[PDB]
């Protein structure tokens, strides 16, 4: 790509952290130069604090401005709780059910073994639990999970794989628990 | 033990003269402001039927952010950013079935500064039909992530690559995908 001129980056992050609905709220305003946070306002502290030397003059200056501090102190209500209410019904309350499929892997590394894949896709929110069972008994060894993959479009996916050495008659179950369903989803593979 | 986090994230980058303003909820974008068209762009279309945001407020913040960047550049005695190159992964959004529409996702993660060149290639040739992408999304370590998307019809005869260039890389990174 060329153009190796030096670059200089300034980032601001106003973070509203919500605990138990909006029972407890913490506002953390952060200023970041390049990759280093320089100064922050933490509503649990109630005034600006420098994080590095570069942020010292800003915290000193902003802390001398009474109206500024009063607005920042009330922002847990006028900003965080306000914005939480604006979007609650389509963010906090968004629930999209996973699509769950089970299939043997197209590539089978070992003879007499069957790598099974449980694909859990399209869901929201990210909190999910995916388990494998063999004849009804949970497999707590031999399981590989890709972990939670955020797709960038308000959906997630995950893949959970089990190496079996199956016998005819055995029944393997992938079980998914997620806030969008009241009972676990299960998909079975019969060896 | 937090349940949720909403972040208003902004940046300005020189000498590119590039700014961004977005809101994030639990790591997903709610909206950003298009700096050129000067309008609010909702990440899912329906959000614009449920809420509003005055885009001119973002432009006013960005002007302040540009001026502040200049202040910090001088205050740091012109210390520039250290490039951090991205990690790139390509995956589909659902299990692949022959001739069943799907989407390829190119996930570009853990990089800074927020300037990248991304191209989808099919059989080595650039493809743009139906592609889309996100703006630069924040990370807790202050690096960035980004997603590019390519709807496609799986086939045994096509292979794909996500080609990514960034200042922290000395050569283009080509992340490959083909029907298994």
């Amino acid at each position: 790509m060329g153009d190796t001129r030096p670059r200089f980056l300034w980032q601001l992050k106003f973070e509203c952290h919500f605990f138990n609905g909006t029972e407890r709220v913490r506002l953390l305003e952060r200023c970041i130069y390049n990759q280093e946070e320089s100064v922050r306002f933490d509503s649990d502290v109630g005034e600006y604090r420098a994080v590095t030397e570069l942020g010292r003059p800003d915290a000193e200056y902003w802390n001398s401005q009474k109206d500024l501090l009063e607005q920042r102190r009330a922002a847990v209500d006028t900003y965080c709780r306000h914005n939480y209410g604006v979007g609650e019904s389509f963010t906090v309350q968004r629930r999209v059910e996973p699509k769950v499929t089970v299939y043997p892997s197209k590539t089978q590394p070992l003879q007499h073994h069957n790598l099974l894949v449980c694909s859990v896709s399209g869901f929201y929110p990210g909190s999910i639990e995916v388990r494998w069972f063999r004849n009804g008994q949970e497999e707590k060894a031999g399981v590989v999970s890709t972990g939670l993959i955020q797709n960038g479009d308000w959906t997630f996916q995950t893949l959970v794989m089990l190496e079996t050495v199956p016998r005819s008659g055995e029944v393997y179950t992938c079980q998914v628990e997620h806030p969008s369903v009241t009972s676990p989803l299960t998909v079975e593979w019969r060896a | 033990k937090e349940e949720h986090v909403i972040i208003q994230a902004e940046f300005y980058l020189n000498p590119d003269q590039s700014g961004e303003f977005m809101f994030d909820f639990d790591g997903d974008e709610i909206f950003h402001v298009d700096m050129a068209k000067k309008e609010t762009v909702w990440r899912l279309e329906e959000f614009g039927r449920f809420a509003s945001f005055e885009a001119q407020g973002a432009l006013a913040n960005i002007a302040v952010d540009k001026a502040n960047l200049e202040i910090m550049t001088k205050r740091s005695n012109y210390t520039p950013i250290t490039n951090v190159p991205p990690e790139v992964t390509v995956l589909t959004n659902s299990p692949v079935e022959l001739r069943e529409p799907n989407v390829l996702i190119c996930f570009i993660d853990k990089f800074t500064p927020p300037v990248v060149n991304v191209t989808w290639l099919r059989n080595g040739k650039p493809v743009t039909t139906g592609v889309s992408e996100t703006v630069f999304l924040p990370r807790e370590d202050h690096l960035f992530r980004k997603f590019h998307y390519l709807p496609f019809l799986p086939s045994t005869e096509d292979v794909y690559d996500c080609r990514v260039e960034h200042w922290g890389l000395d050569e283009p990174l080509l992340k490959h995908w083909e029907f298994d």
């Binding site: 003059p57 900003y79 | 709610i30």
Partner: peptide
């Protein structure tokens, strides 16, 4: 329902 922003402050000069 309108999202509200926090205003960015001018740094010390």
């Amino acid at each position: 329902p309108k999202y509200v922003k926090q205003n960015t402050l001018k740094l010390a000069r």
